[PDB]
Amino acid sequence: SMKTLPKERRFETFSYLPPLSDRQIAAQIEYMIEQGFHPLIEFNEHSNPEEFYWTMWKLPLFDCKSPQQVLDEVRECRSEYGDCYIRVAGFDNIKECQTVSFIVHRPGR
Template sequence: MSTIQDYPSRLSDPSTRKMETFSYLPEMNDDQIRKQVEWIVKNGWNPGIEHTEPEHARDYYWYMWKLPMFGETEVDAILAELEACHKANPSNHVRLLGYDNFTQSQGANMVVYRGKMV
């Protein structure tokens, strides 16, 4: 049997905090982010973009960037909105959501850009 590794994530140390499953992996490059967006579109989910200050990521609701992109199927348009949100809020975490109409819930949720703790 293999040994399970403990990940030293602590609330007292902001640099170790993790936001979701992907945050335990190395940071995604542009191609990997594109593949995640393509997967959301392929599943027919509606993309949404949210952002928040790193110090409030676990305590508050995230701010919605515009409205969810209902019915958007252009991957480049979604990537452009992610970039626009990041440029407008460079110190904030920016996450991509995929809303599943069938289950009426989030089918995907990942932090694409990480803000820096001040």
């Protein structure tokens, strides 16, 4: 009873899961806060795997002990750039690597 796998563009981590509810998004941002990672919102007109850089929304949220504060920035960013992909990333400054990364908004249509 085998299906042939559909071709579908993906967006790295969590993009094979059914889309994150806002509660699931907040659970991931809570994890960041607890882990001590600094949230950063980035947006891009495209999702090309080859490109290294998306555009930074404001600055990283360095002083953040509040998932809603992150969620507010995502809402605000999505308002200004609903035509764009928006992605939440966590940054570990001790190992200096981005530890978390998932798309929270794909562009309209």
